[PDB]
Ligand binder design. Structure first.
Ligand SMILES: COc1ccc2c3c1Oc1ccc(OCc4ccccn4)cc1C=C3N(C)C2=O
Length: 123
């Protein structure tokens, strides 16, 4: 396994916005409870999961556990930066797998819910 993505970075400027607070309190914490959230709650453990090719294919890994800790640490400058991490997590799943795979069906459902929730953000 590679090191998991950073959740803090002292030379990166931090910020807290109403939209970033909403991304943690509403968007992430609601998605987290979905029946299909479990594969996305932690970095992929390629040793545990017997996926020795995972990080040969996926070069920008991302997961909701990382995103959660980034939000908690005020790691992001703005909501768009956090949204990009969700999108990277979903696209990684489509890249590493195949259409119709169980894990892909899960990501597709979570992505739809994610889009529903970010359609309207606080001002
Ligand atoms: C062949 O299996 C796959 C195949 C592809 C993918 C994955 C697979 O498997 C997982 C198994 C477990 C797991 O986590 C187990 C767990 C997590 C939380 C609570 C309880 N149990 C996460 C994943 C995440 C995956 N992602 C992102 C994939 O693209």
């Amino acid at each position: 396994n590679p090191p998991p993505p950073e959740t803090s970075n002292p030379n990166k400027p931090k910020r807290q916005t109403n939209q970033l607070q909403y991304l943690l309190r509403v968007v992430l914490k609601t998605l987290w409870k979905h029946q299909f959230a479990w594969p996305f709650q932690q970095p992929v453990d390629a040793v545990k999961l017997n996926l020795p090719d995972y990080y040969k294919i996926i070069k920008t890994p991302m997961d909701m556990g990382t995103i959660k800790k980034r939000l908690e640490n005020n790691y992001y400058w703005n909501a768009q930066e956090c949204i990009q991490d969700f999108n990277t997590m979903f696209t990684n799943c489509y890249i590493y797998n195949k259409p119709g795979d169980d894990i892909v069906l899960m990501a597709e459902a979570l992505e739809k819910l994610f889009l529903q929730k970010i359609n309207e953000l606080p001002t």
